[PDB]
Design a protein around this ligand. Structure first.
Ligand SMILES: CC(C)CCC[C@@H](C)[C@H]1CC[C@H]2[C@@H]3CC=C4C[C@@H](O)CC[C@]4(C)[C@H]3CC[C@]12C
Ligand SMILES: CC(C)NC[C@H](O)COc1cccc2[nH]c3ccccc3c12
Ligand SMILES: CCCCCC/C=C\CCCCCC(=O)OC[C@@H](O)CO
Ligand code: NA
Length: 455
């Protein structure tokens, strides 16, 4: 029938906003429920609920149904909302003035708040019936509704404002696009870094002292691909933190830990190659294989101290409205910090290692020119291995310097960094966990090592 597609459209709107379940389940109050919030019965008996389902559906479902049958239930719930809207003196005149798309927005609010809940938006309702859409969208956003479910509320409010479905089309392709891209990013990180660890760990040719440090660097990248990036992607895709306040702080701590360990490992590398080329005899006299393992544990030990300790102590916390409402919402895991912590933490964990790692390695890179004023083909074999260390140090500074310059600009004046931009700089740094294994293939020894392990 020519009216069928409007029922499918509003069904898909709420499918995105409330979700869909095709098997009977208990709602938070414990009543048997299926579909998009269709409450089957308040009776405790499960068979009474399947009985009510089989009546509405016209077959013996055994408590399982198809998408199309879930839409059949939902059309009945939509009729009940319309009846309630039509009997509410504040909502009926607005509903009568709206087209199908804006009626779907209003019906969607009714599913979330109820008629009385929507009826309390007395000024926004006046602006809708007055077709002052942009002003209705502003007043609607000034609400606890908007603050508690901003993703759904932005979509509904955009729908009242434009009169289109574009916010729901934009969402559904965002979940598919970014859901896929994030999946590939987690695999490219876990794949490239798991290979680098096993290659150095079981290739005798690769068991270089510098490769002992690179295994620390790849070990940081692998925790990123296992315990950090996968969970930060759910925020980028789902629009909220699903794992509670406790795992929010732990995730944040491991995230700060791995980044702090990486720049410190790059700094220890630059200090290793500087001692190696300025004082070779002290290098042989000082660095045993076991002491090199001690530097790694000391780096992670300093990193966990400078990462876990401030975070578990809540030294980072701020008093702003943005900060307190996130701290009191488990669904929010934004890392809102006080201006003091934003500086001291990023300086101790990053700028200081970045300057030493950048200052020392340049004096390393110039002394090699000071000792090789010649043309040579075998020199290319050693300029290449030195260049690889300067690429990894460079790609790290590129992937993460913007995130930390914005972090200090954000501290003095939040005006300048959009949250959209700051999140993008943070994912430029997450991408570094992918690049390193690719850069490790620049050297011939890793190259034949990767090629043998894959067959
Ligand atoms: C995700 C968090 C909570 C766990 C942290 C993992 C810790 C234990 C990791 C980080 C880097 C790892 C070190 C890096 C590589 C080496 C060199 C290897 O030849 C011996 C072990 C040693 C020294 C690792 C010990 C374990 C280690 C310190
Ligand atoms: C989603 C958020 C939690 N991700 C954090 C960054 O990946 C890494 O952030 C840091 C690493 C090391 C030191 C740091 N000091 C900071 C101050 C503010 C924000 C991040 C950091 C930070
Ligand atoms: C590597 C490229 C990844 C880009 C990811 C962009 C994240 C998106 O902008 O999120 C906006 C934030 O406001 C969500 O909270
Ligand atoms: Na929170």
């Amino acid at each position: 029938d020519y009216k069928d597609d409007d029922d499918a459209n509003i069904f898909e709107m709420l499918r995105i906003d409330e979700g869909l379940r095709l098997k009977i389940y208990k709602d938070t109050e414990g009543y048997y429920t299926i579909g998009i919030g269709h409450l089957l019965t308040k009776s405790p008996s499960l068979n009474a609920a399947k009985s009510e389902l089989d009546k509405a559906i016209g077959r013996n479902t055994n408590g399982v149904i198809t998408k199309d049958e879930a839409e059949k239930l939902f059309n009945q719930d939509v009729d009940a909302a319309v009846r309630g809207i039509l009997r509410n003196a504040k909502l009926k005149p607005v509903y009568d003035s709206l087209d199908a798309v804006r009626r779907a927005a209003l019906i969607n609010m009714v599913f979330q708040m109820g008629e009385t809940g929507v009826a309390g938006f007395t000024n926004s309702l006046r602006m809708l019936q007055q077709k002052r859409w942009d002003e209705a969208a502003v007043n609607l956003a000034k609400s606890r509704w908007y603050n508690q479910t901003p993703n759904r509320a932005k979509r509904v409010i955009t729908t009242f404002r434009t009169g289109t479905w574009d916010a729901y089309a934009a969402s559904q392709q965002w979940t598919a696009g970014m859901g896929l891209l994030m999946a590939l990013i987690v695999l490219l990180i876990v794949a490239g870094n798991v290979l680098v660890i096993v290659a150095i760990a079981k290739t005798p040719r690769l068991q270089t002292l510098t490769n002992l440090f690179i295994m620390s660097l790849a070990s940081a990248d692998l925790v990123m691909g296992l315990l950090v990036v996968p969970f930060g992607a759910t925020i980028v895709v789902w629009g909220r933190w699903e794992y509670g306040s406790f795992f929010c702080e732990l995730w944040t701590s491991v995230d700060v830990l791995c980044v702090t360990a990486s720049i410190e490992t790059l700094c220890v590398i630059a200090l290793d190659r500087y001692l190696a080329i300025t004082s070779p005899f002290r290098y042989q006299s000082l660095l045993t294989r076991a002491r090199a393992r001690g530097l790694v544990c000391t780096v992670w030990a300093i990193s966990a101290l400078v990462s876990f300790l401030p975070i578990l102590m809540h030294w980072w916390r701020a008093e702003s409205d943005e900060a307190r409402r996130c701290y009191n919402d488990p669904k929010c895991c934004d890392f809102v910090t006080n201006r003091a912590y934003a500086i001291a933490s990023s300086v101790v964990s990053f700028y200081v290692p970045l300057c030493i790692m950048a200052f020392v390695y340049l004096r390393v890179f110039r002394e090699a020119q000071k000792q090789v004023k010649k043309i040579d083909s075998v020199a290319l074999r050693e300029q290449k291995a030195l260049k690889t260390l300067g690429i990894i140090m460079g790609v790290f500074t590129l992937c993460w310097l913007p995130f930390f310059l914005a972090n200090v600009v954000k501290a003095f004046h939040r005006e300048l960094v959009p949250d959209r931009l700051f999140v993008f700089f943070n994912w430029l740094g997450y991408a570094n966990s992918a690049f390193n294994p690719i850069i490790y293939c620049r050297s011939p020894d890793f190259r034949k090592a990767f090629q043998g392990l894959l067959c």
